[PDB]
Amino acid sequence: MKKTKIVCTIGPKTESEEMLAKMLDAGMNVMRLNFSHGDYAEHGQRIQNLRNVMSKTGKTAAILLDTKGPEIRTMKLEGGNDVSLKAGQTFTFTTDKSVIGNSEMVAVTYEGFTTDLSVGNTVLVDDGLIGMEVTAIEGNKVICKVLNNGDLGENKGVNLPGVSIALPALAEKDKQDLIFGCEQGVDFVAASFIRKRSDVIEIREHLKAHGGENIHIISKIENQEGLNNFDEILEASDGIMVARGDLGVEIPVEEVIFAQKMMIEKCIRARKVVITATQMLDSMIKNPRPTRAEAGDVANAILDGTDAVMLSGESAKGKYPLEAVSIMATICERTDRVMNSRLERITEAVCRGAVETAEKLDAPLIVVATQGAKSARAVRKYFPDATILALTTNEKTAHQLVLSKGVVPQLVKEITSTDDFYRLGKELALQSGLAHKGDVVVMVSGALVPSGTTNTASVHVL
Amino acid sequence: MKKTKIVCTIGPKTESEEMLAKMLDAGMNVMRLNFSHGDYAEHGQRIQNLRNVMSKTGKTAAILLDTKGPEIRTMKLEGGNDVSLKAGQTFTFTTDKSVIGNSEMVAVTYEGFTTDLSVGNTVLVDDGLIGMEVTAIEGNKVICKVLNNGDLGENKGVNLPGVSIALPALAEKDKQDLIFGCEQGVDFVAASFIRKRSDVIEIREHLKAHGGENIHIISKIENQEGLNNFDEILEASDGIMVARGDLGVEIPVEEVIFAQKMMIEKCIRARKVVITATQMLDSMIKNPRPTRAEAGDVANAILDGTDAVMLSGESAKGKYPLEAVSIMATICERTDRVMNSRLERITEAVCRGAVETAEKLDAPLIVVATQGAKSARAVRKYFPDATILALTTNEKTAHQLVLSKGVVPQLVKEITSTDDFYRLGKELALQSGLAHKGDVVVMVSGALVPSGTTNTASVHVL
Amino acid sequence: MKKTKIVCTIGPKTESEEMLAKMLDAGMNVMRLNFSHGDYAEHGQRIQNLRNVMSKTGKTAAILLDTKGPEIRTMKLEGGNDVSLKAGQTFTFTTDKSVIGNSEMVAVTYEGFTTDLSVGNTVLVDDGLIGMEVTAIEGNKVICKVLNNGDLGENKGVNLPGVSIALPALAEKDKQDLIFGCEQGVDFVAASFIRKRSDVIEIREHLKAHGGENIHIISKIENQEGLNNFDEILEASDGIMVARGDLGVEIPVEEVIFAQKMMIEKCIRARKVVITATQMLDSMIKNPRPTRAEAGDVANAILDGTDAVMLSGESAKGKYPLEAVSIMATICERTDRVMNSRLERITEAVCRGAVETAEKLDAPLIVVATQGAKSARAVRKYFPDATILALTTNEKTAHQLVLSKGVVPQLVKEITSTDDFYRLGKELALQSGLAHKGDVVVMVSGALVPSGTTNTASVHVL
Amino acid sequence: MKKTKIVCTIGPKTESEEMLAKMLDAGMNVMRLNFSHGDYAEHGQRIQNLRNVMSKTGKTAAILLDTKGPEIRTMKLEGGNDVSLKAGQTFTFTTDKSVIGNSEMVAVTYEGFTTDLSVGNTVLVDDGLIGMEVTAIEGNKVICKVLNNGDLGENKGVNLPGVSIALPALAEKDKQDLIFGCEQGVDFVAASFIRKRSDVIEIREHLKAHGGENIHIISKIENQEGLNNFDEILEASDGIMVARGDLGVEIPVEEVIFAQKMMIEKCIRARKVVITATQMLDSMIKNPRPTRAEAGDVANAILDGTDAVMLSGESAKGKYPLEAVSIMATICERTDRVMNSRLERITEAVCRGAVETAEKLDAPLIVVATQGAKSARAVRKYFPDATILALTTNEKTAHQLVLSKGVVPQLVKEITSTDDFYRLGKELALQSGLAHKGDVVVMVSGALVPSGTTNTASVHVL
């Protein structure tokens, strides 16, 4: 009965066909492959297992490849031992990768570190554990003053709040991973650390060069530059992933919530899927129940209007994966049921009216003859109470629509005319079990128009 | 182009093919035949002339037969001389037709005069010129005391305010006139003096017995009983003619305006055509310009929301028929221009939305695939800015639709599917000159439903 | 109790104290003195009689002086005999007053006749009975070609549609009549034939020179120029009288209705009283009942939203004055009953809210502490269901408020504070019989602000 | 600039006058004394220090006593050593307080434990660390089956989801604490573990018996019974504290968020303060910045519409109290500024209109002449953009209004009339610095009515 869709990162604990089947029962809609870890063999087997489960059970799911992305990391230390940095001390980064670190200096992986930073900038190390202020940049060195005590381990992430970083759109490993995703025909690519329009285009060109022109690109917004260029990025993307955890290190902490609300709102208006991700039910890596706060955070993202919510470690490596999917579905069901429609160009006019009509006739189902995703998403924009049954002849579209809120996709052989759509949609509506004899359904399609124009709405009794 | 339709009574000055053609140019939509006068040869000729003009010019118009109706009239007087009745005097009516009248007593045409009146009732003679109060009823005599001074001529109408009168629905001449109308295939019958549901029913059974089952019945509301039973009468009728002059004699004068507003409103809700008639431009029997008051009365009837307005003597016998049609058309245009749409069943929902959609996309035209008149009338109910182009395969339906406001009917060979309707309706929309390349049109129809269900709305660019 | 106010022209049949008292009972609110007729003794007596009736009965009423105005009239004819002008013939007007007229030429009263006309202009004689087109202007002659057959009598009015006429704002007799009005302390002056701002100004400077600075000026809009400059005229005037009969001769007939609606709307927005006048119940000069049309015309004027309606000959000379007032009152009540409030400056905000508050609490009465008329008119603008009880310390203001719709004025000694107003207004509200123990009243006033600012609204239970 | 008010639990780190002054600068509005800990001397000194800081700085703050409340705790264990409970094992509670516990059995503090529980009920121990299901109740023993592994320490809290517990409204210690609060003249008492109407009444009677009739009671809703009787409890209380942490152990976890939204909504409608408390910025006990999640949780409570937010350990015992207040204020400011008004009995009519008027005139300030808190809260209900300046002669009311959102209280000597209110409020509005010359203010009060009726709204320019 839930409308919000659930993305599950699959890992060792959940990769078996047995587990995947149980995950789908519990509410999983989309499989996420986190390419920060694993090799092509492991990920290939996971894709294989899901498609076996789908083939045998007739259930639908989508597959999402989440790239590792480019990053700035610190490097190694003397004796591999942590060093204890003291507030007020001088500390230096070097772009020289050959340097082994200690309490006074460590190397970073990114050659451009000296270029992109400025005296006065803040360097955060290890998810903001240690904060430092740059006091001088000299040759290949960024000299800083440590702001807080902390322990520096080896290989830790670095964040540069408010700095535009000249890392490439794709790491070299990323480029290979994307070829793999095309080879495997994944449905979505979630691109890490997206900062500007040109990153999305570079990814679009790379997928297109390997037969991936139909793979939808979900841009992960992670830093202030991403936020600044959000509209540009949304325009070029097929969707957005809101990386709350990263944003919590990169922008003022009181802003993260409104960045999440802003981005979701704009994706709905733009008719593009949005996924709310990171720091959802993390405590369930270890515990069989989430915290009150985690429950409240998930629900408010649903109320904000996200299409989907995402599980990370709690479904890949955690001790209670099935519990975490199940309680997620419960939060989804509980929250979805109290949401109302938002009624506030030909396509917007017809779809908005179609929903308004569905509500005024207490119609449980809106049947959409979707060319691509556009038409089903144009109905979903107004948050219908009714479920969207989206008829498509395109198998990739069927998979991709799994991610949109309240959309039930249906693969069909063909629809040759508008009246055939009405005849066929009424049958498939009854067959779906989503509606019954005597219910009203509203039927949406294009007629005598190019694909991706919706110009027709029709009311039928089953 | 005006939206309000003009009914013109045709008489000796306007019956030629030459005049009818010029009447149509001036704005006439419907020819009214007043069967109070003329014989079958004269009326048949008028019907023939119009149909010739229609064939030669390709213009569409409907034909309306208006019955004389049953009436109560006074009788003859000694020496055929007017007599002066004095307020307070005794005066008696007799049902004995043989009696010649004088200052003390006159005969009436209706035997039921004694039965239907009651001591205390008011008797009005000659359009309320002389008013009388019944003081006794005895045998075949109704004794009254005169209320006001006035002069009593021969053969004058009698009105009995607030009295239920037991005249038959149809006079004997009416029954013959109606068969003539069936033989001649008129589009409308306007039945005079309708008082209750059963009157409408008796007329329908008379028509259905002579092949007139497709002739629409317009009930003329003329008295208090008619007003009391208006809902019943509307339900049974195809439309209503508001006879303001008659109502001014039967009900209190300050009520006539609201009785016209009430009746017009309810006809629109019911999707049934309404004509505002009587005392429109009567001064133009004699003069080439109407009165300020006359222009204002007509305009407020259009503003009340009438489908059509009617010319009587001013187009049948008057000295300036074309002047009267023309200035009527001018008022219709001037008043139609400032009217707005009125936005609040599957049919109701779809049609209301189609109009809302038209306005929101600035569509000049709503194209309706009408099964009978219901569907075009269902769109017209919301007073669209857009003109209604009504496709129908039935020639009688096409004629009848001429009387509905803002409706242009179009006879078509057939439409075999919904996509066929769109293809054809776009062609016909361009051909009509009513819309042009690049305009938006909204196309309304039924799909996989019984006739007289409207369940589909579709938006197209020409 | 009706809300719309009735202006009655008083003449020989209605001037006695006996009749005036009965006129007030029947619904008269304002006495109109038509200075086209009567001398100062007669009018002074009418003023005296009313004021006697007012003192004896404690009823309130206002007095309105209506000027004759400047006019253009034709002159004398040979043997004083009508002449028959034939369409197409040449006919000449001369500014030479000494000329006696005939079939070919007549004199007019206005020398400026040559100046203001132009070849091509239309000249109308005798309320548009005969229409003429100027073909040449030469010396003191305006040569025309007659457009329609008609009979030309002596001393008939001339109208020049669409022409700007350079008559003075006031005739010489008018100037004397206005001083008389100042001496007599009338409440209103209705200025005839107002055409532009400067006419209103010249009348105000004439009044202010004779102690009339507090006499409200009602501008009579009678022709096209007046309509063109309406905003200017409204700005300068205290109110507007709509002279429908005159406008029917000056502008195209289908426009008169909308000119009445436009003018009434703008008066309401401007918080300035409007009177709908001319051609109301004229048939009741002769008959004891009006026409259906007459009743409908009056009612639509109230529905348009007029403050007041006016009786002319029917109450001055007619055979049935009390009948005409009574049936007018009946129409006012019947029409006022079905009208709703019209909810959309500090004053605007407070007054609009006070009405909204009244309706939401079902308050029968809004009590206004009015500095001059502005504040009561500011409440009246929204057409409250509640009656307006207007407290004022100024006796002239009290009289003038009689003309505003739904306003009951009340003369008070004083109100020294806001809490005093509430105490007193609750007492007076009960005393008025307009509200009762337990009713809610809304009390509107200014507090710590210049007069004519309304900034305070207060709700009390009686 | 923030409107949301901040409650700070004061403890050893923050009790000095130096700290309290810095806490107020940072945004503290209300001091919370947590009587779970501390003795009357410590709490008395804290009240003394704040009142010194208030006296010296002229700043306002309120004092809130939060009772410890009645509780169910486990007791002691053999050798004071934790015992390791295994899922599936039998475990028994005994009401015998003399029993020292072990791995098989422990004593509880509440005699009624056997009575109130039923076979099948769930017993949670130590904030839900260990869950057990009751399998038998026998004499003074509740025998259970352990559901999950866990370690049992000494003296841990017990929760009984969905059980109605017959603990008293007040512990014996609570009753003494309340006398202390009266002695000290605290402004608020926050009563722990409120379950039904009768608890609020018992507290009301106890305060009244010690001169505390003016102390506002904030009911802490902590369990399912509290939720079930919420309306009853709200009715008897002056406000509500939402104890999210407790609710997270007592009710289904997906419900806690909607219980928080429900309760806040109802308190706003009821015109009673609501405080959102527990699990706000807990990580700041140890860290100088909150988490993204904690930031998001606080902001969503503000968006829900809470009057105030509360700091617990992070301001009493934590290492970074001033940081935690400051970042709280920042979240408040950032969130308050993007909230809109909610415009949707005489008092509701006038106040709702007063806010609507304030918005339509872009008024920065609504000045309220408040008798008690009622009137200022009746304005706050509609979430005005404008700040509420609440004039009161009552010093306790002034303190209590500190807790209401967007209310600036102002103690005044007296107001003798309505015009004095306007004169005085305009001065105090300018003096406050909240508005400036030329701004509009809306002024709200009662006039000629019993206290706690608001019937007057007035608009003034400064």
Side-chain angles (χ1 to χ4, degrees), chain C residues 12 42 70 78 96 98 142 179 186-187 211 216-217 226 244 261 281 291 302 305 312 357 365 373 387 449 456 461:
Chain C
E42 284 173 323
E78 289 175 25
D96 185 336
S98 83
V142 184
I179 296 170
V186 301
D187 304 302
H216 280 194
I217 299 170
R244 292 108 47 72
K261 284 165 158 45
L281 305 173
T291 280
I302 292 158
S312 296
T357 294
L365 192 66
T387 291
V449 285
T456 298
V461 187

Short mmCIF file of all heavy atoms in Angstrom, two decimals, chain C residues 12 42 70 78 96 98 142 179 186-187 211 216-217 226 244 261 281 291 302 305 312 357 365 373 387 449 456 461:
data_model
loop_
_atom_site.label_atom_id
_atom_site.label_comp_id
_atom_site.label_asym_id
_atom_site.label_seq_id
_atom_site.Cartn_x
_atom_site.Cartn_y
_atom_site.Cartn_z
N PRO C 12 -47.61 69.76 -6.66
CA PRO C 12 -48.90 70.18 -6.08
C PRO C 12 -49.68 69.08 -5.38
O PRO C 12 -50.25 69.34 -4.32
CB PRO C 12 -49.67 70.73 -7.29
CG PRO C 12 -48.61 71.27 -8.15
CD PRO C 12 -47.44 70.30 -8.02
N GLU C 42 -43.47 78.69 -3.73
CA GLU C 42 -43.94 77.31 -3.73
C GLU C 42 -42.90 76.36 -3.15
O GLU C 42 -43.23 75.49 -2.32
CB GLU C 42 -44.32 76.90 -5.15
CG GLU C 42 -45.61 77.49 -5.59
CD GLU C 42 -45.94 77.25 -7.04
OE1 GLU C 42 -45.01 77.26 -7.88
OE2 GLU C 42 -47.12 76.93 -7.32
N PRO C 70 -28.77 74.39 -18.27
CA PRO C 70 -28.74 75.01 -19.59
C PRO C 70 -29.24 74.03 -20.64
O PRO C 70 -29.05 72.82 -20.53
CB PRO C 70 -27.25 75.31 -19.80
CG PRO C 70 -26.57 74.19 -19.06
CD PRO C 70 -27.45 73.88 -17.86
N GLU C 78 -44.31 79.51 -37.69
CA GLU C 78 -45.36 80.31 -38.31
C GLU C 78 -46.74 79.79 -37.94
O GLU C 78 -47.04 78.60 -38.14
CB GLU C 78 -45.19 80.30 -39.82
CG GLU C 78 -44.00 81.09 -40.27
CD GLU C 78 -43.78 80.97 -41.76
OE1 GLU C 78 -44.77 80.70 -42.48
OE2 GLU C 78 -42.61 81.09 -42.19
N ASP C 96 -30.02 83.41 -34.99
CA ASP C 96 -30.90 84.58 -34.92
C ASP C 96 -32.22 84.22 -34.23
O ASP C 96 -33.06 83.52 -34.81
CB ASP C 96 -31.15 85.13 -36.33
CG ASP C 96 -31.96 86.43 -36.35
OD1 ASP C 96 -32.73 86.71 -35.41
OD2 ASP C 96 -31.83 87.18 -37.34
N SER C 98 -34.75 86.07 -33.62
CA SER C 98 -35.94 86.78 -34.11
C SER C 98 -36.71 85.99 -35.16
O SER C 98 -37.87 86.32 -35.44
CB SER C 98 -35.56 88.15 -34.68
OG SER C 98 -35.11 88.05 -36.02
N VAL C 142 -26.64 76.82 -39.72
CA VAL C 142 -26.18 75.43 -39.79
C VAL C 142 -27.10 74.73 -40.78
O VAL C 142 -28.25 74.41 -40.45
CB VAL C 142 -26.19 74.73 -38.43
CG1 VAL C 142 -25.62 73.32 -38.55
CG2 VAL C 142 -25.41 75.54 -37.39
N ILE C 179 -28.61 80.22 -5.05
CA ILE C 179 -28.55 81.06 -3.86
C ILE C 179 -29.75 80.76 -2.98
O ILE C 179 -29.62 80.54 -1.77
CB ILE C 179 -28.47 82.54 -4.25
CG1 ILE C 179 -27.16 82.78 -5.00
CG2 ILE C 179 -28.56 83.40 -2.99
CD1 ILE C 179 -27.05 84.16 -5.64
N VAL C 186 -30.61 73.65 1.83
CA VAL C 186 -30.82 72.30 1.29
C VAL C 186 -29.59 71.45 1.52
O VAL C 186 -28.48 71.95 1.71
CB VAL C 186 -31.20 72.34 -0.20
CG1 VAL C 186 -32.47 73.14 -0.42
CG2 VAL C 186 -30.03 72.91 -1.01
N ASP C 187 -29.79 70.14 1.49
CA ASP C 187 -28.75 69.15 1.74
C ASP C 187 -27.99 68.78 0.48
O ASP C 187 -26.77 68.54 0.51
CB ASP C 187 -29.41 67.91 2.33
CG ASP C 187 -30.21 68.22 3.56
OD1 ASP C 187 -29.61 68.74 4.52
OD2 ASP C 187 -31.43 67.97 3.54
N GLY C 211 -22.44 80.64 1.31
CA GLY C 211 -22.55 79.83 2.50
C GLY C 211 -22.97 78.41 2.28
O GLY C 211 -23.39 77.76 3.25
N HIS C 216 -23.87 69.15 -0.57
CA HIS C 216 -23.30 68.14 -1.45
C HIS C 216 -23.83 68.30 -2.87
O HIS C 216 -25.02 68.51 -3.08
CB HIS C 216 -23.59 66.74 -0.93
CG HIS C 216 -22.68 66.31 0.18
ND1 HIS C 216 -22.56 65.01 0.60
CD2 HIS C 216 -21.81 67.03 0.93
CE1 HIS C 216 -21.68 64.95 1.59
NE2 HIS C 216 -21.21 66.16 1.81
N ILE C 217 -22.93 68.18 -3.84
CA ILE C 217 -23.27 68.36 -5.24
C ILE C 217 -23.41 67.00 -5.92
O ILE C 217 -22.44 66.23 -5.97
CB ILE C 217 -22.19 69.20 -5.95
CG1 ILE C 217 -22.12 70.58 -5.31
CG2 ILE C 217 -22.47 69.27 -7.45
CD1 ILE C 217 -20.94 71.38 -5.78
N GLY C 226 -20.20 63.93 -20.81
CA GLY C 226 -20.25 63.57 -19.40
C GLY C 226 -19.68 62.19 -19.13
O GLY C 226 -18.85 62.02 -18.23
N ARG C 244 -30.86 58.24 -17.29
CA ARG C 244 -30.94 57.24 -18.35
C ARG C 244 -31.67 57.76 -19.60
O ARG C 244 -31.22 57.52 -20.73
CB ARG C 244 -31.61 55.99 -17.81
CG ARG C 244 -30.81 55.25 -16.77
CD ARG C 244 -31.39 55.40 -15.37
NE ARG C 244 -32.84 55.18 -15.30
CZ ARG C 244 -33.46 54.02 -15.42
NH1 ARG C 244 -32.80 52.89 -15.62
NH2 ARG C 244 -34.78 53.99 -15.35
N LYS C 261 -24.13 50.69 -15.39
CA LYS C 261 -23.39 49.76 -14.55
C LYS C 261 -22.00 50.30 -14.22
O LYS C 261 -21.60 50.30 -13.06
CB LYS C 261 -23.31 48.40 -15.23
CG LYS C 261 -24.59 47.56 -15.18
CD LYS C 261 -24.48 46.42 -16.19
CE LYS C 261 -25.41 45.24 -15.90
NZ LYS C 261 -26.80 45.58 -15.53
N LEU C 281 -40.93 54.84 -13.17
CA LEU C 281 -42.30 54.35 -13.10
C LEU C 281 -43.25 55.33 -13.79
O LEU C 281 -44.38 55.53 -13.34
CB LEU C 281 -42.70 54.11 -11.65
CG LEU C 281 -41.79 53.19 -10.85
CD1 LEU C 281 -42.19 53.16 -9.37
CD2 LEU C 281 -41.82 51.79 -11.41
N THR C 291 -45.61 48.98 -15.11
CA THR C 291 -45.39 47.95 -16.10
C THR C 291 -44.42 46.89 -15.58
O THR C 291 -43.53 47.17 -14.77
CB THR C 291 -44.84 48.61 -17.37
OG1 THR C 291 -45.94 49.19 -18.08
CG2 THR C 291 -44.15 47.66 -18.30
N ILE C 302 -31.25 48.50 -8.75
CA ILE C 302 -30.87 48.15 -7.39
C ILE C 302 -29.81 47.04 -7.41
O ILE C 302 -28.82 47.09 -6.67
CB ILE C 302 -32.13 47.75 -6.59
CG1 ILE C 302 -33.04 48.97 -6.37
CG2 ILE C 302 -31.76 47.17 -5.24
CD1 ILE C 302 -34.48 48.63 -6.07
N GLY C 305 -26.53 48.01 -8.00
CA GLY C 305 -26.00 48.48 -6.74
C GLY C 305 -26.23 49.95 -6.42
O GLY C 305 -25.47 50.53 -5.64
N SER C 312 -40.14 60.88 -10.47
CA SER C 312 -40.28 62.22 -11.03
C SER C 312 -41.74 62.64 -11.11
O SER C 312 -42.40 62.82 -10.07
CB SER C 312 -39.64 62.26 -12.42
OG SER C 312 -38.25 62.02 -12.32
N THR C 357 -16.39 40.72 9.56
CA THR C 357 -16.61 40.29 10.94
C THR C 357 -18.09 40.25 11.26
O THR C 357 -18.57 39.29 11.87
CB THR C 357 -15.89 41.23 11.91
OG1 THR C 357 -14.47 41.11 11.73
CG2 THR C 357 -16.22 40.88 13.35
N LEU C 365 -26.23 44.76 12.93
CA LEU C 365 -26.00 46.19 12.97
C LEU C 365 -24.52 46.50 13.03
O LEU C 365 -23.79 45.92 13.84
CB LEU C 365 -26.72 46.79 14.18
CG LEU C 365 -26.83 48.29 14.23
CD1 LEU C 365 -27.72 48.78 13.11
CD2 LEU C 365 -27.42 48.66 15.58
N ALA C 373 -19.56 62.19 6.10
CA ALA C 373 -20.17 61.00 5.50
C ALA C 373 -19.17 59.90 5.17
O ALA C 373 -19.58 58.75 4.97
CB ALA C 373 -20.93 61.37 4.24
N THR C 387 -27.47 46.45 8.96
CA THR C 387 -27.83 47.84 8.80
C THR C 387 -26.75 48.72 9.41
O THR C 387 -26.10 48.33 10.38
CB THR C 387 -29.18 48.10 9.45
OG1 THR C 387 -30.20 47.43 8.70
CG2 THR C 387 -29.48 49.56 9.47
N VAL C 449 -6.65 59.86 15.36
CA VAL C 449 -6.37 60.06 13.93
C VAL C 449 -7.16 61.26 13.42
O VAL C 449 -8.18 61.63 14.02
CB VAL C 449 -6.70 58.80 13.11
CG1 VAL C 449 -5.64 57.70 13.32
CG2 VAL C 449 -8.10 58.30 13.46
N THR C 456 -10.47 51.81 13.57
CA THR C 456 -10.79 50.98 14.72
C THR C 456 -12.09 50.19 14.52
O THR C 456 -13.08 50.72 14.02
CB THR C 456 -10.86 51.83 15.99
OG1 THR C 456 -9.57 52.40 16.22
CG2 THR C 456 -11.20 50.95 17.17
N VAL C 461 -21.65 42.77 22.46
CA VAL C 461 -22.93 42.11 22.66
C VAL C 461 -23.84 43.11 23.36
O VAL C 461 -23.41 43.83 24.26
CB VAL C 461 -22.78 40.83 23.50
CG1 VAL C 461 -24.10 40.09 23.53
CG2 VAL C 461 -21.67 39.93 22.92
#
